[PDB]
Amino acid sequence: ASPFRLASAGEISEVQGILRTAGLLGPEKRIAYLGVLDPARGAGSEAEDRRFRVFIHDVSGARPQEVTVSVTNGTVISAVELDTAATGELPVLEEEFEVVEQLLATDERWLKALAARNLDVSKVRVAPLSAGVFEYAEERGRRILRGLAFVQDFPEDSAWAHPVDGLVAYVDVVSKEVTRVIDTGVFPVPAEHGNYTDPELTGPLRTTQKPISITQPEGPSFTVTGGNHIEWEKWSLDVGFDVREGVVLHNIAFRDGDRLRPIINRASIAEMVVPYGDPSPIRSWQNYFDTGEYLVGQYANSLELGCDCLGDITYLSPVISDAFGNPREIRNGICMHEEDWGILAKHSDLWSGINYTRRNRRMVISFFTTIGNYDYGFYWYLYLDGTIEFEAKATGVVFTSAFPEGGSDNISQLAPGLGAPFHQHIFSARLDMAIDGFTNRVEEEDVVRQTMGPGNERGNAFSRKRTVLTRESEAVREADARTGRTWIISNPESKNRLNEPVGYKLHAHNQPTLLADPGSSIARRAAFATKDLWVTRYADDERYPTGDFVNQHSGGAGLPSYIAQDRDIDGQDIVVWHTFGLTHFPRVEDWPIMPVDTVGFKLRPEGFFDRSPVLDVPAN
Amino acid sequence: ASPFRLASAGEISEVQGILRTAGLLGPEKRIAYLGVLDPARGAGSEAEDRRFRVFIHDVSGARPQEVTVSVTNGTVISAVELDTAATGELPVLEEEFEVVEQLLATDERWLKALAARNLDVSKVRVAPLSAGVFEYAEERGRRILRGLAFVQDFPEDSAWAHPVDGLVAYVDVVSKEVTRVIDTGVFPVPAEHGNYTDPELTGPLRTTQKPISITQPEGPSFTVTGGNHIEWEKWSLDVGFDVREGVVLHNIAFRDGDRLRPIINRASIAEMVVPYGDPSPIRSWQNYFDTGEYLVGQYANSLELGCDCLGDITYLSPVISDAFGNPREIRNGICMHEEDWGILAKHSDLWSGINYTRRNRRMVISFFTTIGNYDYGFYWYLYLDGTIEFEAKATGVVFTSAFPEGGSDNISQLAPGLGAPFHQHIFSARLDMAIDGFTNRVEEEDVVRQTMGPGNERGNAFSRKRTVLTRESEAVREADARTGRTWIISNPESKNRLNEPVGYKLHAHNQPTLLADPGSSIARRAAFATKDLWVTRYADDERYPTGDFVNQHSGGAGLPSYIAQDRDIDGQDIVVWHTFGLTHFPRVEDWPIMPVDTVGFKLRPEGFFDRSPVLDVPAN
Ligand SMILES: [Cu+2]
Ligand SMILES: [Cu+2]
Ligand SMILES: [Cu+2]
Ligand SMILES: [Cu+2]
Ligand code: NA
Ligand code: NA
């Protein structure tokens, strides 16, 4: 009967029922976002109140609404009109992407542009992209999409191989008009196809790969009860799914003796942004917030057996709402399995004559998403030794442009005439901490070099220091790889047997953060991305590092507004936001389809246990 | 008939035969080191000359000798007496480790020390450690070992749980005398056992782990011919074994079309050092060069099936020499297998309606070694997409001391009274490059942030720069994680179809380098470890970054002496030396036996191919 259970189809149809009965979901209305709300803090001796949050867009053009519904009581808790010029446009609706190409086809400016390049409009695809906020005043309070053109020579052709550069169009998707068509000049269309299943380009496929067979004859070592509650090798959690964040982990905890010891209350990727570094006016506005503007959860792939996920796989098929409030199942959307992970520990002792080896493994929870040309895999891992890890795998087809004759400082060449603008992929993991409970504290730990002198006469000593982050005004931190900077989340009220606060250490990869100029528009909308680590005091309305409506919203929101409250985080209910990302100067090897690249982070115990927690792992 | 084949037992017994016949291996002589020499450059139309290098120690105390033998011709090429006070002591002999405890047992100073602490000498193990070079003048030209005491309460007890602090002894292992016994005061002996197979400490073992079965019903996709020549998924290499470096990879190359394209001519871990950061006079001298002083190859474990190595495993059993020149097989010393590696590439395209997924895998070549309390796994990986990776896995039992009452800035507490001095594990990978051949060049690539202004009006642009390292005086480089610094090795004379030099990019982990004071003795003996990347002009006598004899040798050797020649490295036969390491503030979870921690690096293609090299991978 768990309150962290996944949303069922019945609950979604019931939300729809409640909204209709209340006059809130007539035939002009559309769900832009629907998701279950996490139980409120405390909520112990108190039975549940399953609530759902909904953003309801109006196609006629009236003000949209934010609505909370209790499916427990069958009621609307609250409903309020939003002012989207102040607080930001709602997520882009799936039904509005189609509109961009359709409308552009009958627009004279668009056709004149296509005709100057000798292009047939029936062969010209348009990627409909999130618009952000810049110098266009007729855009504030409006839902705009920006269209970039790509030629498809035939229905099975990869249009990404044939970008139409020097051309961008802006479209208003509510009033259904083309607001602008910008043509900076004709660029030649890159001529080679990039059809990665065509034999002319692949050559004869390899016959040298012999099968690797991964099975579990007694089935998997984890259990799933209540739909989504996992127990595995002392670990305990609930796997949730939200249409925005995708897979969310709740109540991550570790069974130490007879004690269930919390570690992380909620773990999500709460934003991901892909800023482009090409100063071309055709692309200098390109910033996909895939989580915030698109809702990456809703484009989660169906994951096929012995192919996306290998081994003994347990699937979850999370349910979401479509634009009318009918439930939609995402079949096999979440993969769950365990894999071998080499050696856990090994020592061969001369003096005892005892030889000891133990195998490691990890629990994997994963989903995959597709937006346009981009494809991302999101993987959480739990290891036997208490380590928690996240990894993002980026693949898909790189976003293209023309390659300027004379070269470029901001674009690489993939094929003759074909460019790939430089860009980053930056993630924010929101980690609502609960190291042995909610009373937590972050310290920043740096290695300390010591001078040869009195007390260190051989000049070999080195040390470490820890600086407590006491208030949110001191809790916006940058990496220092050179001094091995990490951050320890500990519980000052829960000590280990050696009388030291229990903790977990966050190990970042220390990749570059947001490169854009600090005065730029993306540095303001994505302020989280300019720093590696932020710590806030928990509040229930502080969910996203960019705020609740990213679509076409400037600064004034998210992390920088949260931390300004300068609240006490020294032995309180806190939340860690770790920025981490890939910086991509695309290479020839990324074309015509990109091999996986990865980025992530991990947390390892740090005096959390009283000794190794894997002493009781058996041989074999 | 390959000249990169592993040494056979017949060849080693033949080296012994040649040395005896020449009067160089009488009954007072001992092999401290024996290894096959790599073929000389050129060596194409010229048939082979299998040569072996040998260091021959004399137990009576005469000068040791360096000898090169040709087993082809059955001759001594050269033999020369060494002056070990000038050029450094030979590697420690396995037979000399035993001597330390034996001699100390009858030494009055040692027993007086043991008697003050109420300790029975029959229960006191002594770790015999490499001595380095410090303020002791009677040590230069002498082979000294330093002994630290650990109590074993019974024959199957882990003595590491009971360090005897405040006590160190120095011993001369040729003349068989105790030169010094230093007692700084009695420290209590840590009382808890750390027996990780004892049920009282483990508790009942888990029964929750269900088997994971990894098989290959058609066998593995790689072939091994000529003992050690591997072909796998376009890759080609020879797996070598040296008693010092362990597993060495020769002729790493990639089959692109009908062309065999070299990448790395030779890849090894050419040094590894573990500097201790505790200023105690009992430990401030502790610096194990496991590769240089001990020869980690000679302590390679026998790796057992379905346990150290899982799956379809092909073993190699490399042969080495014992102290008398008899061959010794290391049975199942090298594991070779292939493993699944998740998704290689995936895109689901709306416009084409084509959905595409491909699985990745990697070839693994690995060995494991044990020195005293330390156990290390050394793993090379080749991926389908042309990426090459190394990873070191550290485990074993942490080196202990007493934990000072009043705490320590240089030691953590693992159990009541038990300390673990802070230390680092630092590796040097020597990569003799051959990117499409021997004419290579290194550039350092940093991300470039750009100011918002003319030509970048939205403030979104970013770029990259590359700086060619033209001479060895400019080729000692440090990491800059913040600017995403990497190093590209390219061939200026071999261009891809887009007319850019082919290359591979080295991606470091950017962990801290040597923390010791730059004026310290370890900063001088291990000068390589103070910088992330060094590039030298290839020479055949420049093998180790510390020089040919590390045992008790000061500066004046290795990398800093190599680079001073200031040779041209811009489009020449070059060698990259990448320093990378772990900095360890030991945690409670590392006791009583440490879970694996890892560190490494990788190289990925960078315009090496004309497009993705995995286009011809089949579905499934
Ligand atoms: Cu085409
Ligand atoms: Cu990218
Ligand atoms: Cu004991
Ligand atoms: Cu260590
Ligand atoms: Na919290
Ligand atoms: Na070279």
Q: Classify B21 as helix, strand or coil.
A: helix
Same domain, B236 and B190: no
Q: CB within 8 A of A554, min separation 6: which ones?
A: A133, A521, A524, A525
B101 & B71 share domain: no
- With contact defined as beta carbons under 8 Å apart, do B575 and B268 qualify? no
Q: Which residue carries 């090298």 as its tokens? A: B334
CB contact under 8 A, A277 and B463: yes
Strands A29-36 and A51-58 come out as: antiparallel
* CATH assignment at residue B125: 3.10.450.40
Which 3 state secondary structure label does DSSP give A497?
coil
Cis amide prior to B421 (ω within 30 degrees): no
Q: How far is CA A472 from CA A503, A568, A578, B179, in A?
A: 20, 7, 14, 59
Q: What is chain A's length? A: 620
- Tokens 């952000």 sit on residue: A132
Q: Which two tokens stand for residue B388?
A: 């090459």
DSSP strand E in B405-529: where?
411-415, 418-421, 423-433, 441-449, 462-468, 476-477, 486-495, 501-508
| Gaps in chain A after residue (C–N beyond 2.5 Å) | none
A593 contacts B458? CB cut-off 8 A: no
Q: Which two tokens stand for residue B5?
A: 């084949």
> Catalytic site residues of A?
290, 374
B367 with B457, same domain: the answer is: yes
Q: Which residues contact B183 (CB under 8 A, 6 or more apart)?
A: B109, B113, B116, B166, B167
> How far, in Å, from the CA of A577 to the mean position of ligand 2?
22
Phi-psi region of A607 (alpha: psi -120 to 50; beta: other; left: phi over 0): left
A511 and A551: one domain? Answer: yes
Pairwise CA distance, residues B52 & B72, whole Å: 10
Q: Per this entry, what is the length of chain B?
A: 620
**Considering only residues 428 to 457 of chain B, which have any Cβ-Cβ distance to chain A shorter than 8 Å?**
447, 449-452, 455-457
φ/ψ bin of B572: left (φ > 0), alpha (ψ from -120 to 50), beta (otherwise) = beta
3-state secondary structure of A277: coil
Per-residue b or e along B53-71, where b marks 16 or more CB atoms closer than 10 Å to that residue's CB: bbbbbeeeeeebbbbebbb
- Min Cα distance B219 → chain A (Å) is 7
Nearest to A86 by CA among A141, A138, A134, A144: A141
For B375, which residue in chain A has the nearest alpha carbon? A347
Query: Tokens representing B405?
Result: 């009452």
Let me know: does B379 contact B599? Beta carbons within 8 Å.
no
Query: At a CB cut-off of 8 Å and minimum separation 6, what does B57 contact?
Result: B29, B30, B31, B32, B64, B90, B93
**Residue A313's CB: how many other CB atoms inside 10 A?**
18
Tokens standing for residue A59: 């196609």
CA-CA distance, B610 to B607, in Å (whole number)?
7
Residue with tokens 């990490």: A486
Resolution of the model in angstroms: 2.2
B586: which 2 tokens? Answer: 């030991």
Question: Chain A, 276-295: which have a CB under 8 Å from a chain B CB?
Answer: 276-279, 284-285
Specify whether B405 is located in the same domain as B551: yes
Cβ burial, residue A77 (10 Å; 0-12/13-18/19+): middle
**Maximum distance among all alpha carbons in chain A?**
87
Rounded Cα gap, residues A262 and A362, in angstroms: 19
- B421 near B279, Cβ under 8 Å? no
Cα separation, B562 vs B455, in Å, equals 45
E strand or H helix that includes residue A420: strand A418-421
Q: How many domains does chain A have?
A: 3
What distance, in Å, lies between the first and last C-alpha atoms of chain A? 37
> Which secondary structure element, helix H or strand E, spans residue A345, and what is its range?
strand A334-348
Report d(CA A150, CA A193) in Å as an integer.
12
Task: Answer whether B223 touches A (CB < 8 Å).
Answer: no
3-class SS at B476?
strand
Question: Are B174 and B228 found together in one domain?
Answer: no
Q: Last residue of a domain, which of B87, B112, B147?
A: B87
Looking at the DSSP bridge assignments, the partners of residue B149 are B126
**Structure-block tokens of residue A571:** 């032995």
DSSP codes, A367-417 = EEEEETTEEEEEEEEEETTS-EEEEEEEEE----EEPPTT--SSEEEEETT
Nearest Cα of chain B lies from the Cα of A367 at a distance, in angstroms, of: 12
Q: Which two tokens stand for residue B41?
A: 């450059």
Distance, CA of B539 to CA of B537 (rounded, Å): 6
CA of B150 to the centre of ligand 3 (A): 10
Contact A594, A395 (CB under 8 A): yes
- Alpha-carbon distance B174 to B64, whole Å? 12
**Which B residues in the span 301-340 are in contact with A, Cβ-Cβ below 8 Å?**
301, 304, 306-308, 310-311, 338-340
Would you state the structure tokens that stand for residue A348, as one six-digit string?
Answer: 């061969």
Residue type for B205, please? L
CA angle A327, A329, A331 (to 5 degrees): 180
A104 and A77 share one domain: no
| Run of H or E residues at B213 | strand B213-215
**Alpha carbons B530 and B478: distance in angstroms, whole number:** 9
**Coil, helix or strand at residue A441:** strand
Using a CB–CB cutoff of 8 Å, tell me whether B201 touches chain A: yes
| Cα separation, B394 vs B397, whole angstroms | 10
Count the neighbouring beta carbons within 10 Å of the beta carbon of residue A44: 6
For residue A311, the one-letter residue type is G
Do A129 and A147 form a contact (C-beta atoms < 8 A)?
yes
Tokens for B238, please give them. Answer: 């020879």
**Residue A397: what are its φ and ψ, rounded to 5°?**
-110, 130
Cβ burial, residue B180 (10 Å; 0-12/13-18/19+)? middle
Tell me how far apart the alpha carbons of residues A127 and A169 are, in angstroms, rounded to a whole number. Answer: 10
Residues with Cβ within 8 Å of B390's Cβ and at least 6 positions away in sequence, in order, are: B267, B269, B378, B379, B380, B381, B429, B600, B601, B602
Breaks in chain B (C–N beyond 2.5 Å) sit after: none
CATH number of the domain that residue A367 is part of: 2.70.98.20
- Token code pair at residue B226: 């000529």
C-beta neighbour count of B87 within 10 angstroms: 15
Question: Nearest 5°: CA angle at A196, between A301 and A156?
Answer: 75
> Hey, is the C-beta of B155 within 8 angstroms of any chain A C-beta?
yes
Distance CA A93, CA A87 (A): 18
Residues of chain A with Cβ-Cβ distance to B461 below 8 Å are 277-279, 284, 409-410
Is there a contact between A604 and A386 (Cβ–Cβ < 8 Å)? yes
With contact defined as beta carbons under 8 Å apart, do A327 and A9 qualify?
A: yes
Taking the CA atoms of residue B156, residue B160, residue B164 and residue B165 in that order, the dihedral angle to the nearest 10 degrees is 180
C-alpha distances (whole Å) from B127 to each of B62, B143, B275, B400 are 27, 16, 17, 12
A509, A565: one domain: yes
Q: State in Å, rounded, how far the first CA of chain B is from the last one.
A: 37
A37: burial class by Cβ within 10 Å (0-12, 13-18, 19+)? middle
* Nearest CA-CA partner of B90 in B115, B65, B112, B122: B65
Question: Residue A596: its chain B contacts at CB < 8 A?
Answer: 342-346, 360
Q: Which residues of B touch A617 (CB under 8 A)?
A: 205-206, 209
Residues B55 and B115 placed together within one structural domain of the fold:
no
Give how far B319 is from chain A: nearest CA, Å: 21
In whole angstroms, give the CA distance from residue B325 to residue B31.
6
Distances in whole angstroms, Cα of residue B569 to Cα of each of A427, A599, B489, B491, B575? 39, 33, 11, 12, 9
- Edge-to-edge strands, sheet with A401-402: A401-402, A418-421, A411-415
Integer Cα distance of B311 and A208 in angstroms: 18
Mark yes or no for CB contact B458/A339 under 8 Å. no
**What count of other Cβ atoms lies within 10 Å of the Cβ of residue B223?**
12
Cis peptide before A560 (omega within 30 of 0): no
Same domain, B481 and B494: yes
Expressed as residue numbers, the domain containing B11 is 1-87
Sequence-ordered alpha helix ranges (H) in B505-601: 521-525, 559-563
B129, B520, B586 from A459: Cα distances, Å? 20, 5, 21
Residue B611 and residue A595: Cβ atoms within 8 Å?
A: no
The alpha carbon of residue A600 and the mean position of all alpha carbons in its chain are separated, in whole angstroms, by: 11
Q: Could you give the C-alpha distances from A325 to A144, A145, A320, A537, B387, in angstroms and in order?
A: 24, 24, 9, 34, 46
Phi, psi of B405 (to 5 degrees): -60, 135
Rounded CA gap, B611 and B605, in Å? Answer: 11
From A41, A63, A87, the end of a domain falls on A87
* Residue type present at position A39: P
CB contact at 8 A, B396 and B250: no
Same domain, B52 and B167: no
Q: Catalytic residues of B, which ones?
A: 290, 374
Tell me the nearest-neighbour CA distance from B40 into chain A, angstroms. 34
Mutate to test the interface with B, among A273, A312, A351 (most CBs of B within 10 A): A351
**B292 known ligand binder:** yes
Q: Which residue has the tokens 């609960």?
A: A434
Q: What residues pair up with B273 in beta bridges, in sequence order?
A: B289, B426
Interface contact flag, B481 A357, Cβ < 8 Å: no
Interface of A with B in 485-504 (CB under 8 A): 496, 498, 500
Residues of B with Cβ-Cβ distance to A515 under 8 angstroms: 447, 449, 462
Are A148 and A275 in the same domain? no
CB contact under 8 A, B588 and A610: yes
The residue among B27, B56, B87 that closes a domain is: B87
Angstrom distance (rounded) from CA A594 to CA A588: 9
- Distance from residue B490's CA to the centre of ligand 6 (Å): 11
Which tokens is B70 given?
């040709």
Picking from B296, B347, B418, B617 by the largest number of A CB atoms within 10 A of its own CB, the best residue to mutate is: B347
Structural element, H or E, at residue A59: none
Residue B457 main-chain phi, psi, to 5 deg: -70, -25
- CA–centroid distance, residue B424 to ligand 4 (Å): 6
CB atoms within 10 A of CB A463: 19
